[PDB]
Amino acid sequence: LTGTGVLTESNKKFLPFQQFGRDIADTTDAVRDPQTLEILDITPCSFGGV
Amino acid sequence: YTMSLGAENSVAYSNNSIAIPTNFTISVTTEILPVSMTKTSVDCTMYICGDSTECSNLLLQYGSFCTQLNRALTGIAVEQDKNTQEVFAQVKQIYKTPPIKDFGGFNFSQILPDPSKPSKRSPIEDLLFNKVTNGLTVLPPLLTDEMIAQYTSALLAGTITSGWTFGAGPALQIPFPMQMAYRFNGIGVTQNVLYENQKLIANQFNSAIGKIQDSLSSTPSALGKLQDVVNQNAQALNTLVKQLSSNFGAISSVLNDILSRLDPPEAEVQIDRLITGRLQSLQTYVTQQLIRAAEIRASANLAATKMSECVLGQSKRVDFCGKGYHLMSFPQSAPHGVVFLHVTYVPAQEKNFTTAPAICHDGKAHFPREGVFVSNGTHWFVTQRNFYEPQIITTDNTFVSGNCDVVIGIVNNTVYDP
Amino acid sequence: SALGKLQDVVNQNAQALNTLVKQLSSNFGAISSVLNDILSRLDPPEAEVQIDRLITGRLQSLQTYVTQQLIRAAEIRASANLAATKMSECVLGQSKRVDFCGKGYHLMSFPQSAPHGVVFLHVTYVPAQEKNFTTAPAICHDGKAHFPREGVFVSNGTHWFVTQRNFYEPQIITTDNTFVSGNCDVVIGIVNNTVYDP
Amino acid sequence: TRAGCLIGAEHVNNSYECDIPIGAGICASYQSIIAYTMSLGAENSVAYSNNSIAIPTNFTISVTTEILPVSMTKTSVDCTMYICG
Ligand SMILES: *[C@@H]1O[C@H](CO)[C@@H](O[C@@H]2O[C@H](CO)[C@@H](O)[C@H](O)[C@H]2NC(C)=O)[C@H](O)[C@H]1NC(C)=O
Numbered sequence: 001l002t003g004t005g006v007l008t009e010s011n012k013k014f015l016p017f018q019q020f021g022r023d024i025a026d027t028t029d030a031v032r033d034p035q036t037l038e039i040l041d042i043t044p045c046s047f048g049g050v
Numbered sequence: 051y052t053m054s055l056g057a058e059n060s061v062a063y064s065n066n067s068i069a070i071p072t073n074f075t076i077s078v079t080t081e082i083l084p085v086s087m088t089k090t091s092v093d094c095t096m097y098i099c100g101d102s103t104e105c106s107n108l109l110l111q112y113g114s115f116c117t118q119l120n121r122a123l124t125g126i127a128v129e130q131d132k133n134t135q136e137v138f139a140q141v142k143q144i145y146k147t148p149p150i151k152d153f154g155g156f157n158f159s160q161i162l163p164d165p166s167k168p169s170k171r172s173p174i175e176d177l178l179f180n181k182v183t184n185g186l187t188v189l190p191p192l193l194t195d196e197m198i199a200q201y202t203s204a205l206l207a208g209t210i211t212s213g214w215t216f217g218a219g220p221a222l223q224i225p226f227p228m229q230m231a232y233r234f235n236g237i238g239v240t241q242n243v244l245y246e247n248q249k250l251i252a253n254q255f256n257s258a259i260g261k262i263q264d265s266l267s268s269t270p271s272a273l274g275k276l277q278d279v280v281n282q283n284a285q286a287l288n289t290l291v292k293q294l295s296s297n298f299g300a301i302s303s304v305l306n307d308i309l310s311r312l313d314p315p316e317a318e319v320q321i322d323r324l325i326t327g328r329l330q331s332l333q334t335y336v337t338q339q340l341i342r343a344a345e346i347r348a349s350a351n352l353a354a355t356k357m358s359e360c361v362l363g364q365s366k367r368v369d370f371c372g373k374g375y376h377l378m379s380f381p382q383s384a385p386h387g388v389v390f391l392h393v394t395y396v397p398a399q400e401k402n403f404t405t406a407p408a409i410c411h412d413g414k415a416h417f418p419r420e421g422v423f424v425s426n427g428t429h430w431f432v433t434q435r436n437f438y439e440p441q442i443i444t445t446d447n448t449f450v451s452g453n454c455d456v457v458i459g460i461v462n463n464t465v466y467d468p
Numbered sequence: 469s470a471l472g473k474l475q476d477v478v479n480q481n482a483q484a485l486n487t488l489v490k491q492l493s494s495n496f497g498a499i500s501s502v503l504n505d506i507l508s509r510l511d512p513p514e515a516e517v518q519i520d521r522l523i524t525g526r527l528q529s530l531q532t533y534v535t536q537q538l539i540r541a542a543e544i545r546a547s548a549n550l551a552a553t554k555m556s557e558c559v560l561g562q563s564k565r566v567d568f569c570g571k572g573y574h575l576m577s578f579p580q581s582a583p584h585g586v587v588f589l590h591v592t593y594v595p596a597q598e599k600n601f602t603t604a605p606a607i608c609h610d611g612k613a614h615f616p617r618e619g620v621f622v623s624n625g626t627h628w629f630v631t632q633r634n635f636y637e638p639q640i641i642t643t644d645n646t647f648v649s650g651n652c653d654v655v656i657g658i659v660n661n662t663v664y665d666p
Numbered sequence: 667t668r669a670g671c672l673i674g675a676e677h678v679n680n681s682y683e684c685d686i687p688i689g690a691g692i693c694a695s696y697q698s699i700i701a702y703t704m705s706l707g708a709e710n711s712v713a714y715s716n717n718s719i720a721i722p723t724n725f726t727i728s729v730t731t732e733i734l735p736v737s738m739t740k741t742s743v744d745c746t747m748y749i750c751g
């Protein structure tokens with residue numbers, strides 16, 4: 001699962017069978033690192049209009 | 051079942067009977083009008099393609115579609131601010147109420163701003179604000195909710211302290227039981243009726259304002275017109291998001307999977323399918339947003355008309371400013387909307403009387419100058435049309451035109467001479 | 469920037485035409501945006517595909533242009549219905565509607581033709597040079613309450629008069645311009661003053 | 667600002683009318699480029715009391731302009747010639 005984002009620490013406690021996380025709008029906002037079983041929030045980079 | 055339109059009401063019509071009201075109800079009704087929407091802006095290039103440079107290189111083959119979508123959304127976004135500007139910014143003077151709230155028994159605490167609240171909103175406006183709950187950006191509105199509340203506070207202070215004079219020029223102060231009497235004369239009821247029954251009218255007005263607050267606090271579907279606009283905008287944005295998960299006939303909905311699994315000659319075809327699907331989705335979204343923007347602009351033009359004609363003046367238009375004879379109206383800010391509290395006069399406790407078009411006296415026909423001839427069975431009086439106030443038929447309230455041989459239904463009665 | 473509303477419509481229509489003309493320069497994924505180049509370079513089995521791509525791109529552009537043209541036509545029709553209402557109610561009559569025919573008390577209006585538009589010159593009456601007076605709802609005289617027929621009781625400090633509401637014109641409080649209803653015990657704020665009898 | 671970061675405009679504590687809208691109550695104007703919270707109106711306190719009235723002693727005949735668009739340019743597009751020539 002690839003993408004671009006800011007990977008921060010997450011307070012969402014996954015169940016052990018779950019790997020990725022989705023919001024209402026079906027966008028991956030939470031993920032589990034495969035090396036160390038920790039949960040990371042994926043905040044989209046700060047795009048803006050100039 | 052087969053539905054029923056209404057209860058039958060056979061009006062007791064005859065050629066010489068009239069019904070005259072003997073009492074009145076000061077009725078306050080709510081009217082909720084949407085003004086603006088959420089200002090949404092979509093980066094078309096990022097929505098179709100994200101950060102894929104091959105996708106943007108293929109998207110440049112389609113020309114200036116993204117420029118047209120961005121310009122249409124920019125036009126909608128500035129149209130919402132123009133709508134709010136036309137609705138609420140109808141005064142260039144920020145009026146305040148006096149610190150002493152001596153309005154002859156009339157209570158405006160539920161509609162005036164609360165100093166204890168940090169948002170400086172009225173209790174009704176506070177309840178209204180409590181009852182409303184990938185390249186996408188939401189532009190903030192130009193007027194904040196505090197400044198819209200300040201505009202409504204200025205309008206309320208102007209219409210309380212100065213009448214309709216502030217809407218036509220400089221604000222000329224006038225006592226509120228005099229303003230009310232002027233409004234009574236606008237609907238054709240004499241000033242004396244207001245002055246004699248001023249305590250009852252103030253009590254009815256305060257009771258109606260409290261019933262408005264109770265009805266807003268007790269009905270979940272009161273603010274459904276604003277909630278429908280909010281739900282439509284959120285559901286359209288959610289549908290535009292969910293259209294990204296569709297492959298539109300390609301092997302995958304992800305551009306990175308296509309660019310990593312295929313060489314560019316076939317990835318160009320798959321990305322082209324995804325581009326035309328996402329472009330069709332974005333064009334559909336922008337078209338329905340333009341249609342909803344036209345609808346919201348029509349509603350905001352209506353709201354500006356009601357602001358000008360019901361709040362800044364007294365309107366003779368039937369059912370434009372509430373049900374009944376319109377007395378005044380009060381504006382209240384709402385999330386993306388305006389709530390008009392229409393204070394109207396409803397006649398009540400009507401009574402039958404025997405009526406005649408003219409009075410025959412000394413071979414002359416007498417017609418009422420402003421009222422109507424009524425009879426309780428034995429004696430004839432003249433009264434104003436919207437309230438029972440019997441007076442002796444004199445030459446001061448009647449006028450003479452012709453003899454008694456022409457008017458059909460003329461009756462014989464004496465006409466007093468002062 | 470006085471005539472910006474008409475110039476906005478003119479600029480939007482000219483910009484829509486310029487965008488529609490500019491959309492012919494795009495190939496929409498084909499080898500060229502020129503139809504003659506495709507028809508002179510390729511056999512009809514593959515020129516059919518290239519021309520099909522150009523056709524669907526140009527048809528999408530034309531349908532888009534017609535869609536915003538219909539939306540702008542609806543907006544201009546609403547504005548023209550408003551302008552016809554203003555022509556009927558402000559020019560052909562005197563309107564009681566507040567701020568429908570200008571700021572202030574509306575007197576009359578003049579229509580003027582404009583390129584793709586109309587300009588209404590609203591002649592209105594604005595009150596000015598206001599003055600404080602001490603006012604009362606009624607005059608108590610001979611145990612009777614007197615109320616103004618059309619005006620308002622004012623006082624300059626010592627003497628009471630009745631005047632019309634939108635212009636200061638003090639007149640002696642008489643029976644000709646007042647009417648009697650009830651006694652003085654009911655009306656809150658009634659004051660004592662004589663009422664002249666002609 | 668709540669609209670975003672504004673670089674190149676000097677924020678001032680004075681309130682003026684909105685010249686160029688920025689958003690969230692912020693507007694920009696040229697006088698250098700300044701950014702400010704826009705004023706809604708001049709503040710007027712109405713001298714209300716329960717027995718005083720204000721009566722006009724004069725008037726102004728005021729003529730104002732109202733510009734309303736009526737029609738557009740009637741454009742027709744030959745669909746076959748536009749797509750195909
Ligand atoms: C005025 O008089 C008419 C007729 O006397 C009243 O109409 C009647 O009302 C009763 C009670 O509702 C009905 O049962 C009759 O059928 C009505 N008659 C007709 C011909 O309609 C009327 O109620 C009176 N108005 C008031 C205010 O008392």
Ligand SMILES: *[C@@H]1O[C@H](CO)[C@@H](O[C@@H]2O[C@H](CO)[C@@H](O)[C@H](O)[C@H]2NC(C)=O)[C@H](O)[C@H]1NC(C)=O
Nearest residue numbers: 072073074075076249250251253254257398399
């Ligand atoms: C006109 O209607 C009002 C109410 O709308 C009447 O006031 C009520 O009078 C009764 C008896 O006098 C009281 O018990 C109520 O408390 C009053 N209500 C209010 C809100 O004050 C009034 O009496 C009616 N007048 C006439 C002449 O019918």
Ligand SMILES: *[C@@H]1O[C@H](CO)[C@@H](O[C@@H]2O[C@H](CO)[C@@H](O)[C@H](O)[C@H]2NC(C)=O)[C@H](O)[C@H]1NC(C)=O
Nearest residue numbers: 151152153155156157158159160173256259260
């Ligand atoms: C105007 O109305 C308000 C609310 O309708 C009145 O405030 C109430 O006052 C009573 C007694 O003072 C309290 O028990 C209530 O809790 C108050 N309600 C609220 C919402 O604060 C007020 O007294 C009325 N009169 C004036 C002159 O303001």
Ligand SMILES: *[C@@H]1O[C@H](CO)[C@@H](O[C@@H]2O[C@H](CO)[C@@H](O)[C@H](O)[C@H]2NC(C)=O)[C@H](O)[C@H]1NC(C)=O
Nearest residue numbers: 403424425426427428429430431439440441442
């Ligand atoms: C119709 O109204 C008149 C005046 O309001 C009534 O006449 C009065 O009736 C009372 C009741 O007996 C007498 O005390 C008064 O002296 C009467 N005044 C005059 C000038 O005669 C009359 O009774 C009413 N008729 C009906 C049928 O209600």
Ligand SMILES: *[C@@H]1O[C@H](CO)[C@@H](O[C@@H]2O[C@H](CO)[C@@H](O)[C@H](O)[C@H]2NC(C)=O)[C@H](O)[C@H]1NC(C)=O
Nearest residue numbers: 409410411412413414453454455460461462463
């Ligand atoms: C109302 O008054 C007129 C005039 O006083 C009455 O007309 C008279 O009627 C009688 C008999 O009907 C005639 O003999 C007279 O010649 C009439 N005089 C005139 C001048 O026309 C009329 O009858 C009265 N109506 C009622 C209902 O009493």
Ligand SMILES: *[C@@H]1O[C@H](CO)[C@@H](O[C@@H]2O[C@H](CO)[C@@H](O)[C@H](O)[C@H]2NC(C)=O)[C@H](O)[C@H]1NC(C)=O
Nearest residue numbers: 601602622623624625626627628629638639640
């Ligand atoms: C209020 O207006 C009345 C009428 O204009 C003033 O009464 C007149 O005042 C002048 C100047 O003192 C006298 O010459 C007249 O004789 C007065 N007329 C009468 C009928 O008394 C009155 O002075 C004004 N009061 C104030 C405070 O300006």
Ligand SMILES: *[C@@H]1O[C@H](CO)[C@@H](O[C@@H]2O[C@H](CO)[C@@H](O)[C@H](O)[C@H]2NC(C)=O)[C@H](O)[C@H]1NC(C)=O
Nearest residue numbers: 608609610611612651652653657658659660661
């Ligand atoms: C207005 O005039 C009335 C009547 O002339 C005054 O009422 C009288 O007041 C005195 C003293 O307060 C009492 O002794 C009388 O009994 C009252 N008579 C009546 C009929 O009420 C009233 O005080 C005057 N008001 C002003 C402000 O001058």
Ligand SMILES: *[C@@H]1O[C@H](CO)[C@@H](O[C@@H]2O[C@H](CO)[C@@H](O)[C@H](O)[C@H]2NC(C)=O)[C@H](O)[C@H]1NC(C)=O
Nearest residue numbers: 148597598599600601711712713714718720721
């Ligand atoms: C009418 O009288 C009131 C109070 O006597 C005047 O209001 C005052 O006006 C001055 C001058 O601008 C201010 O400094 C005060 O703050 C005002 N007082 C209040 C309570 O607002 C008012 O100007 C007078 N109107 C006219 C036309 O002279």
Ligand SMILES: *[C@@H]1O[C@H](CO)[C@@H](O[C@@H]2O[C@H](CO)[C@@H](O)[C@H](O)[C@H]2NC(C)=O)[C@H](O)[C@H]1NC(C)=O
Nearest residue numbers: 594595596597598636722723724725726727728
């Ligand atoms: C009402 O206002 C008008 C102006 O709007 C005043 O007319 C001016 O009066 C001064 C002094 O008499 C002259 O110098 C000006 O030339 C006049 N202007 C015009 C356009 O005629 C008028 O005097 C005011 N009247 C009152 C009673 O205040």
Ligand SMILES: *[C@@H]1O[C@H](CO)[C@@H](O)[C@H](O)[C@H]1NC(C)=O
Nearest residue numbers: 016032033034035036037038
């Ligand atoms: C995988 O390797 C990491 C390396 O730090 C180790 O910490 C972890 O215990 C290993 N096992 C699992 C199941 O993650």
Ligand SMILES: *[C@@H]1O[C@H](CO)[C@@H](O)[C@H](O)[C@H]1NC(C)=O
Nearest residue numbers: 064065066407457458459460
């Ligand atoms: C009203 O109708 C009655 C019959 O119901 C009739 O006798 C009378 O003349 C009529 N009056 C008028 C003015 O038409």
Ligand SMILES: *[C@@H]1O[C@H](CO)[C@@H](O)[C@H](O)[C@H]1NC(C)=O
Nearest residue numbers: 152154656657658715716717
């Ligand atoms: C107006 O208020 C004063 C107190 O400020 C009071 O004495 C007077 O009776 C009031 N008049 C009316 C008509 O309410």
